[PDB]
Design a protein around this nucleic acid. Structure first.
Lengths: 118, 173, 59, 77, 137, 94, 47
RNA sequence: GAUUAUUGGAGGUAGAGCACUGUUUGGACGAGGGGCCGGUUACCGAAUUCAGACAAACUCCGAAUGCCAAUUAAUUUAACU
RNA sequence: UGGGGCGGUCGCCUCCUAAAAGGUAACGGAGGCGCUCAAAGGUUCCCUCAGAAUGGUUGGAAAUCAUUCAUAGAGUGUAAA
RNA sequence: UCUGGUGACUAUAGCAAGGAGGUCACACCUGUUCCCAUGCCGAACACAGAAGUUAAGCUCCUUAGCGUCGAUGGUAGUCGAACUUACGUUCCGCUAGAGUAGAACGUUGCCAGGC
């Protein structure tokens, strides 16, 4: 037997996802990465290959002991506030290789609640 | 009664092998209990019966494997459910095994019991069963056809001899 | 963990007179004649066998 | 006698525009079965696998991976 | 009596005969061989003849390899008949030899016995030939 | 172990390659460490004499221009139909 | 395998022709199809 | 309309030559029917390690052809409608 | 229609002949079609290779079961590409 | 400004082998109460944790070992020309495939922490 690691499988699934998913500086990508203890969010124009905003669950602006889910709610709220200054329009949500469920759904709903038009 | 194994990690293996850390100890993962054909021309009732038999053997509902091809040399096609299994993982695995090896050679009537080696070289058993030491909750009081099982222990072990050292934990070597 | 289809197994006392390995389970729920508390305080129905006295190897 | 005088009418497959030439907004770039060439930028794939332009510009055949090809159409004018 | 066991296609185009030989231009198995200097088709009754002639002179002495195999069928019309109502039935099997190619090799025998064996074989073949040894240098 | 060589100048055509092979010369390259690639020509009978005495896998001190190179035969192209060497490669072994 | 005609109960038109075979679908089939008289999707049913 | 240089593609062109393969051949190796007592061996079949053939019904390349672009030069006042 | 007859043929699809594109003949070389599918269509999604050994109650030695290498060699309703 | 997220390039970027490592990371790990879940099974997916752990994944450093790349030279072939239609020859352009020497244990963009 051998235990398959989770992140390479995630990367395969993410590659299959990102084939009709790109950031074009008016719908920019909202990439999500969750490891095991945090979550991270980037906002990228894929056409230039340039990220624009960033938020994380280990950033000291949002770091407490809630759930990993209300944490994710804060990460979504933070990235919505950070991108709220400019280009806060319709974006495209890239969930990585992850289910739209649990932590990722929480951060997506939090980002959607607070101005982002996806 | 799992904690006996939680002694066996160093009762033999950190003794006889002396690994660098307790993470690299061999460890048994899954139990697969592949039932048999019971060729369901009329034995669909016997299929249901043997499935219920394996239910009484193990508290998980079995999965009914169908035939993988439409071969000759047998009347079979795609579909045609011709096997059952249960994957045992945890407390069901330990609770099954600790109960099983207590009664197993007691109803096997054998000195050596299985073989010193039936192994593949990766710490996998390929074990055969004549089906008597099982059904100790509902006996032969209602079943007609005897059965037999194919049970393989798969481990995190990498070789057959470390499977023997894990088979020093109430085994038939 | 799918409720309903699984057979009711439960930790009934498999306590032999030979070392009393009462950590097994199943549906052999007889009348709870012995409820040993450090063992399973349940049906005792596996109360005696040749389990840990005379194995055909380990007699 | 024999039994061998059948054929099919040849379909005129292959490239229909060149690399470097200007095309208008909907014209057929490549006819093929399957995807010998994949579609790239501004190039769509028909239901018979016809590769067509979606804007007007210059057609570029380029490579895709180690071993695949694609056509893109760039808007520059 | 050399012929393949099965072919994918019973009627094949006929081989081109121009050029020099693609491969097999060296003695690799025995001590001596017979090299071809012109081009022909070789028809596997010629192979059987040249092998029988070469064998019985060696009196079951050394060993002989055949570096040529007939893969290609050839057809002909049986009686002389009107032109073209399809291809005819398969008649025999040919290999195609071009200059450079070793046809036979022998080992386990003296040099002059090998020269005499390969000369006797070469009178059966439809191609010009030359006795050769192992290359070195 | 003492072949002599002459540097071929640039762009031998197909005609003078076979004209040069009509004499007793054979075209050759020298490459390896110590040198760049040098296109030389070599007399054939002398090369056969050196090979006969030094072995197929031997060492040759052959002179290019000014200098001499210790060198071994890397490969060679042979024409089996008329038995002449037609190209030879020299690997500088130092 | 036969041709079937879908009929709208309120459109008053038989505009949608399809196919089915009989041993797989002995019953009369029905779908929700757009009829442009009423400008909406309605139940069309095999006659 | 054209006709004739450099640069770019397309075909994976063929001629050649073998990039897995698919097929066909003469290499040399221990296990399985088996020779026998369920094996001892031979021969076979299949499996792994030299040299050939088709690649008309093939894979790794690419003379000449063709398509085209030049804010690019000699030719035909003819072009295409 | 390599005189005519007898035999064999009218259409469509796919290879090969067919010689960088495309096109290309023969009573030249090989094969299919004259439908099927209420899911074998759409769609978010989800979820995602055999064989080979290996060694096992069955064991056709392989049906199902288990480990590891295995190219889409598997698989793809239907012939080939 | 080392990692780590995330893009771009034909594996020169991969497999194999050998050696090191760890709370700003990163994984194994512990469990099923809850969202959710296995055509059986918390294996996976999901969630709640954080006792253990560098063993494996992962990172970093050594190897050319298998793959990958790969000239120069010289040959097959071939456009054009001239002999002649020889299983050809000659002149001139274009120069293969293979194989040799040799490369290669990746460069580069953006971001945030660590700094």
């Amino acid at each position: 037997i051998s235990k398959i690691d989770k992140n390479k499988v995630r990367l395969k699934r993410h590659a299959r996802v990102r084939t009709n998913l790109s950031g074009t500086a008016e719908k920019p990508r909202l990439n999500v990465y969750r490891s095991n203890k945090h979550i991270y969010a980037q906002i990228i124009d894929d056409n230039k290959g340039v990220t624009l905003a960033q938020a994380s669950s280990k950033d000291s602006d949002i770091a407490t002991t809630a759930t990993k889910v209300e944490l994710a709610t804060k990460v979504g709220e933070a990235i919505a506030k950070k991108a709220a200054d400019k280009g806060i329009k319709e974006i495209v949500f890239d969930r990585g290789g992850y289910l739209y469920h649990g932590r990722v759904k929480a951060l997506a709903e939090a980002a959607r609640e607070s101005g982002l038009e996806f | 009664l799992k904690e006996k194994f939680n002694t066996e990690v160093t009762e033999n293996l950190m003794k006889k092998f002396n690994y660098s850390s307790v993470m690299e100890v061999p460890k048994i993962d899954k139990i697969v209990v592949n039932m048999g054909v019971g060729d369901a021309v009329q034995n669909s009732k016997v299929l249901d019966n043997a499935v219920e038999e394996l239910e009484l053997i193990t508290g998980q509902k079995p999965l009914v494997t169908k035939a993988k091809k439409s071969i000759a040399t047998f009347r079979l096609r795609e579909g045609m459910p011709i096997g059952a299994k249960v994957t045992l993982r945890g407390e069901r695995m330990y609770e099954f095994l600790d109960k099983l090896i207590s009664v197993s050679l007691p109803r096997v009537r054998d000195f050596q019991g299985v073989s010193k080696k039936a192994f593949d070289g990766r710490g996998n058993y390929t074990l055969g069963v004549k089906e008597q030491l099982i059904f100790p909750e509902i006996d032969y009081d209602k079943v007609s056809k005897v059965r037999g099982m194919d049970i393989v222990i798969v481990t995190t072990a990498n070789t057959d001899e470390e499977a023997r050292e894990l088979l020093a934990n109430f085994g038939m070597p | 963990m799918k409720q309903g289809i699984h057979p009711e197994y439960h930790q009934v006392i498999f306590l032999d007179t030979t070392t009393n390995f009462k950590f097994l389970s199943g549906s052999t729920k007889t009348s709870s004649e012995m409820m040993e508390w450090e063992d399973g305080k349940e049906y005792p129905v596996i109360r005696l066998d040749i389990s840990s006295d005379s194995h055909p190897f380990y007699t | 006698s024999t039994k061998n005088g059948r054929d099919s009418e040849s379909k005129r497959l292959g490239a229909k525009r060149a690399d470097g030439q200007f095309v208008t907004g909907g014209s057929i770039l490549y006819r093929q079965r399957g995807t010998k060439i994949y579609p790239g930028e501004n190039v769509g794939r028909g239901g018979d696998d016809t590769l067509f332009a979606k804007i007007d510009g210059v057609v570029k055949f380029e490579r895709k991976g180690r071993d695949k090809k694609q056509v893109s159409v760039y808007a520059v004018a | 009596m050399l012929l393949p066991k099965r072919v994918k296609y019973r009627r094949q185009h006929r081989p081109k005969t121009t050029g020099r030989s693609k491969g097999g231009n060296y003695v690799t198995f025995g001590e001596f061989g017979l090299q071809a200097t012109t081009t022909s088709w070789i028809t596997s009754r010629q192979i059987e003849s040249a092998r029988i002639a070469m064998t019985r002179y060696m009196k079951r002495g050394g060993k002989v390899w055949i570096k040529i195999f007939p893969h290609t069928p050839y057809t002909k019309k049986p009686l002389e008949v009107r032109m073209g109502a399809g291809k005819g039935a398969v008649e025999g099997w040919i290999a195609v030899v071009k200059p450079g190619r070793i046809l036979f090799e022998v080992a386990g025998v003296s040099e002059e016995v090998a020269r005499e064996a390969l000369r006797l074989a070469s009178h059966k073949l439809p191609v010009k030939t030359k006795f050769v040894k192992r290359e070195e240098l | 172990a003492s072949l002599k060589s002459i540097i071929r100048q640039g762009k031998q055509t197909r005609s003078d390659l076979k004209q040069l092979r009509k004499s007793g010369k054979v075209p050759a390259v020298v490459y390896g460490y110590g040198t760049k690639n040098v296109s030389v020509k070599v007399d054939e009978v002398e090369f056969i004499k050196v090979i006969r005495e030094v072995g197929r896998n031997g060492v040759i001190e052959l002179g290019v221009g000014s200098k001499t190179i210790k060198v071994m035969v890397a490969d060679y192209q042979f024409d089996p139909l008329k038995n002449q060497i037609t190209h030879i490669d020299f690997l500088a072994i130092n | 395998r036969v041709n079937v005609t879908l009929a709208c109960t309120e459109c008053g038109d038989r505009n949608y022709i399809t196919t089915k075979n009989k041993r797989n679908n002995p019953e009369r089939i029905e779908m929700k199809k757009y009829c442009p008289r009423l400008n909406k999707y309605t139940l069309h049913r095999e006659t």
